[PDB]
């Protein structure tokens, strides 16, 4: 039930990463490391840089 909002665009460079756009809302799934695992509104998941998203 935790939301993050992207602060910057991120174009994925590996299969496990996720493309995000600035202002996109995402579900936060795992915040244990410096890259966080998120789910988007297309029901896709992947890792993004934790400093590119803001916990709401």
């Amino acid at each position: 039930e935790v939301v993050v909002v992207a602060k910057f665009d991120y174009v994925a460079q590996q299969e496990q990463e996720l493309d995000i756009k600035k202002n996109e809302r995402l579900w936060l799934l795992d915040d244990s490391k410096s890259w966080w695992r998120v789910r988007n509104s297309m029901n896709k998941t992947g890792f993004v840089p934790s400093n590119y998203v803001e916990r709401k």
Partner: peptide, 9 residues
């Protein structure tokens, strides 16, 4: 914008 952290996922 800042650099990404070193990936360790």
């Amino acid at each position: 914008p800042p650099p990404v952290p070193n990936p360790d996922y």
